Design a protein around this ligand. Structure first.
Ligand code: SF4
Ligand SMILES: [Cl-]
Length: 607
């Protein structure tokens, strides 16, 4: 077909079968692709109440119709499965090259079922698929796993894999691809580990079918020109990476410090993208077909070269732990990529532990055997905790599954900066009202990128809003939630929003898939359908709307100092308005009229 390949790879690890199925084009179009196609597939094939580490969970790797097409940022794909860290839907995105090889191999999506009786890996070369013994790879870090597979797979194969953390079912385990790219949050890597799946190698020799090659080329050249002319997409991101945000968020007084105890630090420029570019940066590391190139390639203190850190990583191993050692952040990022864990949950769990120590919940005797401290700014101890958390060594075992469970153990849940048990990232919502809505209602838990209200409230895209204001924020958050669901579903990068809007996405989709398949209104409505489908999945999984909240600190403790001094998030007023503008009930339940309007009639009367 055009855009979509038309084929799905179903792999049952108990029966050790690899079978081809025809893609349901109607469903793939109705849910756009990638995210939406994966969630609908999972919802249709599992009971959401199941334990996410049970063999009955499904591990889905899905691409979008634009994944692999000659358009800007077409290297994106997603992992969809029940998320074991949160109990919610798991929707984790990754770039690099792996997903493009899968699409060039003729597959739009892989559904992995059940569990292998021993560690295995999947080897794909176009339509050739084999399950093989992975006993000699089990236990190896991402880089070594990749090098070992390169010795026994076809040249040019890309590697997707879990590290030791995923093998041990850590709830902060990530899915790694291309050595340093990752579908990281939700503990999705532990689902792969629960299936005894160590890796999937993929080589694709095909091309993505285009309905109109020359039109696609004309549309692509136009969008790239806009991105290259945009100050952020054309200059800031390529030069400083996402790390460009350090000084921006800090100057607005919404950069979390010491586990959100503060919101501003006069040391932030030591870990800025400007400092990184002037020192350890070797070069950009752009994903497939990407003119932005925000990817970082850096030099570790020992001279080793490797993928560099993103903004959220610079924050969680820097300001959040009271550390301002940039070399150390580069090392921590490498260690998280090698062990296969989400940087954000890792650093913010260490930050929660440092606060529990600050407040006397953790005693010196409990960590003496580890020979590490939990003192703010102790960079060496912070780095040392990573390995101990991954392998459950000494006190590290209490941090292996995240801050929410760690703080519950000490009877101090108030020190876990999480929503649905997932750690909130590097933006203090007390000074960003619309963005705080995203954190509270995000279907995948505490997360900023499924609703980056940072764009309009701080960066001025597509317009500048007053971040302290309340009027209009609920509706704006809904729009960003639905637009992000479209971009995730297409197989493109969210950073295209630095220059592009809905019509640009319609232009690229129609040029690739077929003239007039979607219009700006129908496509955004599809994003609303996808977000609402995720909500129904969470309701079926037992995730009540009462889990739409923020830590008490962010609702009651005014920011103590800085440009946002005095502010708290006003969720009490914004959440009901968010449900209302979504067409949901006061208990956050999609109404019968809303389900009919979104084409979700099969779910009427069930919630
Ligand atoms: S903007 Fe960055 S994350 Fe997005 S596709 Fe390009 S290099 Fe990758
Ligand atoms: Cl679960």
């Amino acid at each position: 077909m055009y855009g979509y390949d038309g084929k799905v790879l179903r792999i049952n690890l108990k029966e050790r079968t690899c079978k081809s199925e025809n893609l349901d084009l109607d469903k793939a179009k109705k849910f756009i692709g990638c995210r939406g196609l994966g969630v609908k597939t999972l919802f249709d094939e599992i009971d959401p109440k199941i334990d996410a580490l049970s063999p009955e969970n499904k591990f889905i790797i899905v691409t979008g119709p634009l994944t692999g097409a000659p358009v800007p940022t077409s290297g994106r794909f997603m992992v969809v499965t029940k998320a074991p860290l949160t109990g919610t839907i798991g929707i984790s995105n990754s770039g690099g090259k792996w997903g493009v090889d899968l699409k060039k191999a003729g597959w739009d999506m892989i559904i992995v079922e059940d569990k292998a009786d021993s560690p295995v890996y999947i080897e794909i070369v176009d339509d050739k698929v084999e399950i093989k013994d992975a006993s000699q790879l089990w236990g190896k870090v991402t880089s070594e796993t990749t090098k070992e597979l390169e010795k026994i797979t076809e040249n040019k194969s890309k590697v997707l894999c879990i590290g030791p953390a995923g093998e041990r079912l850590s709830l902060m385990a990530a899915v790694m691809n291309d050595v340093d790219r990752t579908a990281a949050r939700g503990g999705v890597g532990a689902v792969m580990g629960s299936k005894n799946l160590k890796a999937i190698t993929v080589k694709g020799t095909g091309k993505i079918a285009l309905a109109d090659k020359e039109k696609v080329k004309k549309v692509s050249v136009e969008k790239i020109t806009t991105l290259k002319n945009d100050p952020v997409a054309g200059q800031g991101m390529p030069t400083y990476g996402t790390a460009i945000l350090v000084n921006i968020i800090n100057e607005n007084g919404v950069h979390p410090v010491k586990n959100f105890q503060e919101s501003y630090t006069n040391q932030a420029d030591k870990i800025s993208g400007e400092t990184l570019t002037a020192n350890q940066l070797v070069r950009k590391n752009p994903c497939y077909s990407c003119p932005i190139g925000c990817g970082r390639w850096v030099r570790l203190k020992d001279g080793t070269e490797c993928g560099g850190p993103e903004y959220e990583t610079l924050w969680c191993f820097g300001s959040d732990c009271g550390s301002y050692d940039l070399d150390a952040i580069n090392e921590a990022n490498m260690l998280c990529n090698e062990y296969g864990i989400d940087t954000i949950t890792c650093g913010a769990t260490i930050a929660a532990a440092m606060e529990l120590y600050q407040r006397g919940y953790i005693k010196d005797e409990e960590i003496a055997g580890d020979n590490l401290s939990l003192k703010w700014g102790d960079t060496e101890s912070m780095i040392g905790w990573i390995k101990r958390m991954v392998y459950s060594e000494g006190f590290g075992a209490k941090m292996t599954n995240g801050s929410y469970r760690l703080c519950e153990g000490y009877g101090a849940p108030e020190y876990s900066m999480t929503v649905k048990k997932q750690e909130i990232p590097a933006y203090d919502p007390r000074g960003i009202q619309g963005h705080g809505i995203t954190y509270a209602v995000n279907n995948r838990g505490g997360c900023h990128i499924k609703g980056y209200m940072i764009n309009p409230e701080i960066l001025g895209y597509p317009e500048k809003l007053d971040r302290f204001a309340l009027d209009g924020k609920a509706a704006y958050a809904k729009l960003f939630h639905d637009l992000t669901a479209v971009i995730d579903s297409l197989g493109l990068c969210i950073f295209t929003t630095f220059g592009l809007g809905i019509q640009d996405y319609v232009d690229m989709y129609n040029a690739v898939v077929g003239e007039s398949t979607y219009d700006a209104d129908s496509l955004l409505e599809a994003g609303d359908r996808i977000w609402t489908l995720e909500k129904l999945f969470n309701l079926a999984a037992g995730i009540d709307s009462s889990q739409d909240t923020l830590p008490k600190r962010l609702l009651e403790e005014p920011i103590p100092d800085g440009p946002s001094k005095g502010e708290v998030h006003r969720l009490d007023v914004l959440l009901p308005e968010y449900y209302s503008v979504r067409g949901w009930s006061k208990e956050g339940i999609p109404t019968e009229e809303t389900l009919k309007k979104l084409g979700l009639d099969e779910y009427i009367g069930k919630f």
